[PDB]
Write a protein that holds these residues in place. Sequence first.
Motif, short mmCIF file in Angstrom:
data_model
loop_
_atom_site.label_atom_id
_atom_site.label_comp_id
_atom_site.label_asym_id
_atom_site.label_seq_id
_atom_site.Cartn_x
_atom_site.Cartn_y
_atom_site.Cartn_z
N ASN A 18 0.85 -1.19 0.00
CA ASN A 18 0.00 0.00 0.00
C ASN A 18 0.89 1.24 0.00
O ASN A 18 1.36 1.68 1.05
CB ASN A 18 -0.96 0.00 1.18
CG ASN A 18 -0.29 -0.40 2.48
OD1 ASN A 18 0.92 -0.62 2.53
ND2 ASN A 18 -1.08 -0.49 3.55
N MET A 19 1.10 1.80 -1.19
CA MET A 19 1.77 3.09 -1.35
C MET A 19 1.12 3.81 -2.53
O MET A 19 0.49 3.19 -3.39
CB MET A 19 3.28 2.94 -1.59
CG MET A 19 4.06 2.42 -0.40
SD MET A 19 5.82 2.28 -0.78
CE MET A 19 6.45 1.56 0.72
N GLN A 20 1.28 5.13 -2.55
CA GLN A 20 0.66 5.97 -3.57
C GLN A 20 1.66 6.53 -4.57
O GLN A 20 1.32 7.45 -5.32
CB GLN A 20 -0.11 7.12 -2.91
CG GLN A 20 -1.39 6.69 -2.21
CD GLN A 20 -1.14 6.00 -0.88
OE1 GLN A 20 -0.01 5.97 -0.39
NE2 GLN A 20 -2.19 5.43 -0.30
N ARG A 21 2.89 6.01 -4.60
CA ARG A 21 3.92 6.53 -5.48
C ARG A 21 4.97 5.46 -5.69
O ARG A 21 5.10 4.55 -4.86
CB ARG A 21 4.54 7.81 -4.90
CG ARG A 21 4.84 7.70 -3.42
CD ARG A 21 5.64 8.89 -2.94
NE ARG A 21 4.76 10.03 -2.71
CZ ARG A 21 4.47 10.52 -1.51
NH1 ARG A 21 4.97 9.99 -0.41
NH2 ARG A 21 3.65 11.56 -1.43
#
Lengths: 49, 48
Positions: A18-21
């Motif tokens: 779970n990461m956005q980048r």
Amino acid sequence: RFFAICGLQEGFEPFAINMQRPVTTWFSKSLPQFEPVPPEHPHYEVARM
Amino acid sequence: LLVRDEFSVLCRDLYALYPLLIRYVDNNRAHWLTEPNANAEELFRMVG
């Protein structure tokens, strides 16, 4: 791609679950650059007089 | 309280044991190829 068969049914999660980048990365350049001599260099000793 | 069953209950257990150590050595390699499509799509078949 594969995962599934290995992973889920033994307890494993991907690295960036779970990461956005995207994850930044490094590498070795090659181009030499000057740097002060570390005083733990096997065979090199410098000192002031 | 009877050690006479040791010839009946036990001993004969080794007969079925050695028999069991024959089919298991065949199903292993069988499951070493029937796991891809088996775990994918659905199941039910290997669920039994």
